[PDB]
Ligand SMILES: *[C@@H]1O[C@H](CO)[C@@H](O[C@@H]2O[C@H](CO)[C@@H](O)[C@H](O)[C@H]2NC(C)=O)[C@H](O)[C@H]1NC(C)=O
Ligand SMILES: *[C@@H]1O[C@H](CO)[C@@H](O)[C@H](O)[C@H]1NC(C)=O
Ligand SMILES: *[C@@H]1O[C@H](CO)[C@@H](O)[C@H](O)[C@H]1NC(C)=O
Ligand SMILES: *[C@@H]1O[C@H](CO)[C@@H](O)[C@H](O)[C@H]1NC(C)=O
Ligand SMILES: *[C@@H]1O[C@H](CO)[C@@H](O)[C@H](O)[C@H]1NC(C)=O
Ligand SMILES: *[C@@H]1O[C@H](CO)[C@@H](O)[C@H](O)[C@H]1NC(C)=O
Ligand SMILES: *[C@@H]1O[C@H](CO)[C@@H](O)[C@H](O)[C@H]1NC(C)=O
Ligand SMILES: *[C@@H]1O[C@H](CO)[C@@H](O)[C@H](O)[C@H]1NC(C)=O
């Protein structure tokens with residue numbers, strides 16, 4: 001039997017919230033509060049109902065639980081405001097109201113002397129930063145205001161939280177520079193201020209935050225040089241400052257930090273020669289300097305970084321050949337150098353093959369005009385993701401790729417490749433994304449494609465690769481580019497469009513139960529569209545336009561209920577345009593230039 | 606085509 | 611489309627998804643443009659949600675009305691219940707509302723008459739009750755209309771764009787009446 005005062009507070013609290021948990025169904029007629037889901041006594045001292053689909057509003061009686069030490073209501077659907085009495089519990093040491101739909105703002109008077117952790121992340125809080133919470137809450141170690149609508153200056157105050165360890169102000173709308181007082185925080189080990197609108201140089205006084213382990217400054221409007229302060233940050237492990245306007249090179253002290261694991265300054269304005277003392281940087285495993293104006297040949301000493309696993313140097317202004325020293329990049333797993341004026345793909349491939357841990361390789365927009373190596377000597381045993389697109393490469397499908405049995409994604413589109421698509425292309429048990437579009441392949445489409453294991457049985461299992469860099473996709477040069485953080489984020493895809501191909505569309509394509517995009521536009525295919533394409537239940541996009549196909553559109557295609565993109569324009573088809581199911585959501589354009597009769601669109605004689 | 610940046 | 615991505619994520623949490631069709635609906639992205647079964651346009655605004663025959667249940671959400679540019683809503687052949695959210699009437703750009711073969715309950719919202727660009731309204735094989743919104747006639751662009759196999763009632767309109775419809779579209783209702791129907795109106 002719990003205290004009648006807490007028993008009442010709990011009842012008002014849950015009266016404004018649905019649905020009642022396990023748990024609380026008998027709350028009206030019980031005194032046994034200490035065993036209800038979430039409660040903990042010794043007087044209620046904890047109340048934890050995170051992730052319980054709670055909907056409604058925070059009752060005012062919450063501030064009546066005078067002995068509460070933990071208040072956890074994270075990950076629910078609680079709207080409206082936080083009651084004022086909750087800002088006066090004398091014993092509350094952890095407050096977690098993250099991931100709800102809380103709104104309004106934070107009071108100017110707060111008195112939480114016991115408070116250690118304050119988390120209002122992922123809500124709709126508005127207004128000025130609760131900086132003054134450091135006045136009465138002298139013991140506070142964690143402040144989390146991330147993902148809210150806090151705007152205005154990044155105001156002074158947090159420097160009064162002498163004991164503060166985590167400060168997260170990410171994804172708000174803050175302006176101004178980092179306030180001078182914040183550099184008093186001798187014990188701060190996390191500072192996230194990313195995804196705001198902060199501006200100005202990044203002060204050298206950061207050297208004071210000597211306890212920092214993780215510093216995220218990314219996605220702001222900072223400018224000037226990266227401050228040369230990294231010898232005064234012996235515990236720093238993660239510097240993230242991408243998408244700012246930083247300039248100059250990598251400072252000597254950053255270039256010599258033995259603790260740094262990850263460095264990400266992508267999308268800035270860095271320049272000159274890129275040097276990193278790989279003898280000093282013994283912990284470095286991920287490096288992302290893409291979209292900068294570094295120049296010269298690719299650094300020759302990067303493989304001396306013996307832990308370096310993720311390397312992204314894309315879209316800089318390097319040039320020339322992959323340095324000969326990259327043979328010894330023993331640790332390299334993901335390597336992306338898109339759009340970097342790289343030369344000699346015969347040499348680059350012949351060298352990168354030595355990196356036995358290499359699983360993802362992106363060389364898009366490089367080697368302009370050269371010839372894909374035919375040499376069958378090349379071996380990439382662990383290769384999972386190979387994107388070598390838009391290089392105008394000549395030659396034929398590289399036979400050597402056939403022994404990369406773990407291949408999951410292959411893009412060789414927008415080249416000048418010839419010959420037939422070999423049949424071994426269908427022996428990749430883990431292949432789920434294939435783009436060979438916009439080349440000059442000839443001959444029949446190989447039947448092995450129809451037997452691609454990862455497209456037929458929805459229980460084939462493999463480990464997705466985990467590069468730190470994202471992948472972008474544009475259908476055409478104009479199209480807004482799409483971001484994909486995860487390899488398994490890509491739709492299962494067979495893209496053979498814009499080639500020079502002939503033969504039928506094999507009936508057996510009906511086997512591919514889990515194919516999403518099937519694109520064969522702009523070839524010279526013939527025969528009838530098999531009724532068995534209805535077997536591809538997961539189809540979202542089916543483009544057969546611009547071929548030589550004959551016969552009617554199989555009326556079974558109506559069963560394709562995910563089908564949102566569909567064209568058979570510019571063929572030789574005849575009969576009635578199928579109606580309903582998905583079909584009346586397709587535009588007139590999908591059926592134009594045929595002998596196809598409609599009912600509302602394309603009449604007949 | 607897929608690229609990286 | 612971080613707001614539009616948010617509206618669709620609420621719709622996923624409320625819906626019940628045994629087959630994991632919405633598994634790629636990841637809200638940490640700046641838009642839902644790479645989400646399977648969701649088509650964005652040249653400005654990354656959602657124009658299609660294509661979830662027909664996807665073994666979904668649960669119920670819809672008012673949030674769907676955030677998708678200002680939504681043109682095709684295909685949720686037919688599922689086991690979705692509850693009412694039809696009348697925000698839907700804000701989705702002015704809608705050309706197709708396909709919610710047939712579900713178990714929607716309650717009335718057809720009167721706010722559907724605000725869908726001036728609508729051509730296909732198919733709400734058949736559900737559990738709808740009440741009258742047919744006379745707003746609906748106001749829609750000049752209506753082509754296909756299926757209200758059959760429900761529990762609707764009242765005099766069925768035959769003015770405006772309803773002059774084009776016949777008994778199959780209103781068949782099997784609890785107490786519908788008019789020329790277009792088996793019973794005459796009392
Ligand atoms: C790289 O940096 C640029 C410059 O900040 C980013 O471009 C901005 O993008 C935002 C939101 O997408 C726009 O509102 C701004 O107008 C853009 N600024 C400028 C000057 O163009 C860009 O998005 C970043 N790209 C990546 C891939 O990180
Ligand atoms: C609150 O509960 C959630 C979900 O049950 C848990 O993940 C989280 O760690 C808790 N918050 C704190 C601050 O302990
Ligand atoms: C601290 O507590 C006092 C009353 O004890 C209150 O008036 C004051 O506003 C609190 N401090 C701040 C800055 O919130
Ligand atoms: C690089 O690092 C090693 C070990 O820290 C050091 O001994 C060496 O002299 C450094 N060289 C330069 C030029 O930074
Ligand atoms: C490739 O780099 C060039 C040179 O800066 C730039 O014009 C272009 O936008 C980049 N394209 C891609 C897809 O990265
Ligand atoms: C490519 O590089 C290799 C080795 O550096 C060289 O032998 C070969 O001649 C180069 N090919 C061309 C045409 O530059
Ligand atoms: C094919 O690739 C070339 C670049 O190599 C490009 O100019 C052309 O537009 C592409 N064709 C299509 C239709 O994608
Ligand atoms: C198809 O291939 C032939 C031979 O390479 C070529 O002449 C023609 O221009 C190509 N056409 C298309 C549509 O890609």
Ligand SMILES: *[C@@H]1O[C@H](CO)[C@@H](O)[C@H](O)[C@H]1NC(C)=O
Pocket residue numbers: 588600601602
């Ligand atoms: C599609 O066809 C119909 C009838 O021919 C016509 O009313 C409609 O405007 C057409 N759509 C386009 C894009 O013009």
Ligand SMILES: *[C@@H]1O[C@H](CO)[C@@H](O)[C@H](O)[C@H]1NC(C)=O
Pocket residue numbers: 711735759782
């Ligand atoms: C729709 O409803 C009717 C009557 O309840 C039923 O007989 C018919 O089979 C249903 N149609 C479909 C397509 O399921």
